[PDB]
Amino acid sequence: RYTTAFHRPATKNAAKAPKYPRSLKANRNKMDEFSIIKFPLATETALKKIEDHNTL
RNA sequence: AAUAAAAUAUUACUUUGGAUAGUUUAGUUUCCUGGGCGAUGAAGAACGCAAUGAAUUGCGAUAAGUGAUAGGAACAAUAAAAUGUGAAUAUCCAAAAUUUGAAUGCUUGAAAGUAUACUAAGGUAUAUAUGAUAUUCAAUAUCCA
Questions:
Q1: How many Å separate Cα A18 from the centre of its chain?
Q2: Which nucleotide across the nucleic acid strands is nearest to A23, CA versus C1'?
Q3: Quick check: helix, strand or coil at residue A39?
Q4: Whole-angstrom distance between the N-terminal and C-terminal Cα of chain A?
Q5: Phi and psi of A54, rounded to 5°?
Q6: To which protein family does this belong (predicted)?
Q7: Closest by alpha carbon to A43, among A26, A56, A25?
Q8: Calpha distance A2→A37 (Å, rounded)
Q9: How far apart are CA A47 and CA A54, in angstroms?
Q10: CB distance A42 to A36 below 8 Å
């Protein structure tokens, strides 16, 4: 057989086929464009950068 | 020999202190009933959410609260709004339930993270041991062609 080592023979590996769903959690993303951004920084220091650097 | 500043003595009032008296939404013991947790994720820890909160309390990205059922007019420190077309309040109920934790894909120091499969992001599954069934295999281990 030209090889001394004896490994575990390869067998069939069926994919997971659960008979009922694991979780019924609703498919709604809680991180959207509204929850991500709380509010702009309205301080005087943060208001200086808008005019020149064009940064919010 | 002499004065009463100091010193001493009693009473009244004031002061420092908090005893004594009155009081209790706090405890101690005995007895009665139960002794009802968790992979459907427990107990514990962390972080976060009130119009103005630091703690505490309640709660979990639906945040000092949502729906349903009872409940009937409030709350209050200050404004506001909503309100018998239903305010507070209550519940063995329903929806929801962040990071961890037996903690369980892999790693975890105070570590930021990260692989595959299924349904770019999001959400599930994948630890160890283990009972049953299906299935693919290994061993000339016993025969046998």
A1: 24
A2: B124
A3: coil
A4: 71
A5: 60, 35
A6: Belongs to the universal ribosomal protein uL23 family.
A7: A56
A8: 65
A9: 10
A10: no
